[PDB]
Amino acid sequence: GSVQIVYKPVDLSKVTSKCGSLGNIHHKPGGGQVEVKSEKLDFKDRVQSKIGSLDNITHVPGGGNKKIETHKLTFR
Amino acid sequence: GSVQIVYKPVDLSKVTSKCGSLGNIHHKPGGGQVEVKSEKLDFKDRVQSKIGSLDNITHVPGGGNKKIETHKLTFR
Amino acid sequence: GSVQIVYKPVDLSKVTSKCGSLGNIHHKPGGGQVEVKSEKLDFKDRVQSKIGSLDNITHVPGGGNKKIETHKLTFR
Amino acid sequence: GSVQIVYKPVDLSKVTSKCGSLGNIHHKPGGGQVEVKSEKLDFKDRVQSKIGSLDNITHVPGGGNKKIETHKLTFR
Amino acid sequence: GSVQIVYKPVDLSKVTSKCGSLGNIHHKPGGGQVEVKSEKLDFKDRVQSKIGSLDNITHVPGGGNKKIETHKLTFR
Amino acid sequence: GSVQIVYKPVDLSKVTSKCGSLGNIHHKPGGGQVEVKSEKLDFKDRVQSKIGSLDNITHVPGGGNKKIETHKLTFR
């Protein structure tokens, strides 16, 4: 028997920004201390892991906009 | 017997911003202290993990807008 | 018997902002202390985990708008 | 007229201690925050001053005894 | 007329200690934050001053005993 | 007119200690942050001053005893 699919999403959408002067931003961390103890680690399949981080980030994009899409079609 | 699907979402949407001067931003952490103890870690399949973080972020996008879409069709 | 589906949502919506000068923002954390003790950690299937974090965030988007969309169609 | 003074205190005193194992001491301060505002500071003659301190002390003497004496004679 | 002074304090005193094992001492400060503002400072004669300190001390003497004496004679 | 002074303080005193094993001492500070503002400083004569310290000290003497004597004679 006939099976028909039509998949045809239409997207004219926009993510957009205007900004004046972007600046005069100060990030000044006063150190820190970290300890971790373990005997065994055992990581299998898809794993994201951070152990003992002390991480400083300054992130100042003039836009910084995101558009994210998943399109999935599954047939069985 | 005939099966017909049509999938055709229409999207003219907008995510938008206007801003003046963006600035005079100060991020100033006074340190800190962290400890973790374990005997074993045992991570299988999809895992996201942070152990013992001390992390500072300054994030100042001129837009920073987000649009996130899942389009899914599953057929059995 | 014939089975027909049509999926056709229409979206002309807008998420929008206007702002003057965005600024004079101060974030000044006075340190802190964290400890965790464990014998075993044992993480299977989809897991998100933070253990012993001491994390400081300053987040100042000029727009910061979010639009999140699920379109899901399932057939058996 | 003849003036005679004699000053002759005798001191055989003892300040004394005995102790077993001195230990298993933990001092773990959880940070803190301090602010001071002033227009003028104006210090004359003998002054001791602390402004805006955030100071942590661990003090574990095996003895820690103190003996303090003023001997004064004043004549006119 | 004759003035006679004799000053002859006698001191056989003892400040003393015994201790077992001194140890297993942990000092772990979780950071902190300090601010001070002033326009003018104006310090004359004998002055001791700390402004804006953030100071950590661990002090573990095996004795740590103190004996302090002033002997003063003043004649006019 | 005769003035006679005799000053002859006798001191057989002792400051003393005994201790077992001295050790297993941990000092681990998690950073910190300091700010000071001033326009003018005008320090004259015997000023001691610390501005903006962030000082860590570990001090573990096997004795650490102190004996302090001022002997003073003033004649006018």
Most E-contacting residue of F51, F74, F75 (CB-CB within 10 A), to test interface:
F51
Of E28, E33, E34, the CB nearest to B33: E28
| F40-41/B33-37 β-pairing | unpaired
Residues of E within 8 A of F4 (CB-CB) are 2-5
Q: Chains A/D: 3 or more C-beta pairs closer than 8 A? A: no
Q: Are D11 and E11 in contact (CB under 8 A)?
A: yes
* Burial of C65 from C-beta contacts in 10 A (0-12 / 13-18 / 19+): buried
Cα–Cα dist D14/B39, whole Å: 52
Q: Of chain A residues 6-45, which have a CB less than 8 A from chain B?
A: 6-45
Sign of CA dihedral B72, B75, B76, C4: positive
Q: Residue A71 corresponds to which amino acid?
A: H
Between chains, do D25 and E28 touch, taking CB under 8 Å as contact? no
Q: Chains D/F: 3 or more C-beta pairs closer than 8 A? A: yes
Min Cα separation F51/chain A (Å): 17
Residues of D within 8 A of B54 (CB-CB) are none
Cα–Cα dist E33/E40, whole Å: 23
In terms of CA atoms, which chain B residue is nearest residue F54? B30
Breaks in chain E (C–N > 2.5 Å) following residue? none
> Looking at the complex, does the CB of residue A56 fall below 8 Å from at least one CB of chain F?
no
Resolution, angstroms, 1 dp: 3.0
Cα–Cα dist A5/C73, whole Å: 12
End-to-end, the C-alpha distance of chain D in Å comes to 15
**Vertex A59, ends A53 and A65: CA angle to 5°?**
125
Cα–Cα dist C43/C45, whole Å: 7
Cα–Cα dist A40/B40, whole Å: 5
Strand ranges (E), chain A: 3-7, 10-11, 14-15, 22-27, 33-37, 40-43, 47-51, 56-59, 66-75
Q: Are F34 and A28 in contact (CB under 8 A)?
A: no
Sign of CA dihedral D62, D65, D66, D67: negative
Q: Which residues of E34-69 are buried (b: 16+ CB within 10 A; e: fewer)?
A: bbbebeebebbeebbbbbbbbbbbbbbbbbbbbbeb
Min Cα separation B63/chain A (Å): 5
> Looking at the complex, does the CB of residue A59 fall below 8 Å from at least one CB of chain F?
no
Could you tell me which of D70, F69, B61 has the C-alpha nearest to residue A25? B61
Q: Are F71 and D71 in contact (CB under 8 A)?
A: no
Between chains, do B31 and F28 touch, taking CB under 8 Å as contact? no
Residues of F within 8 A of E25 (CB-CB) are 24-26
Sign of CA dihedral F39, F43, F47, F48: positive
Between chains, do E2 and F2 touch, taking CB under 8 Å as contact? yes
Cα–Cα dist E41/D40, whole Å: 6
Cα–Cα dist F3/E75, whole Å: 10
Give the single-character DSSP code of C68.
E
Between chains, do F38 and E35 touch, taking CB under 8 Å as contact? no
> Looking at the complex, does the CB of residue A1 fall below 8 Å from at least one CB of chain C?
no
Of E5, E13, E41, the CB nearest to F38: E41
Residues of E within 8 A of F9 (CB-CB) are 7-11, 71
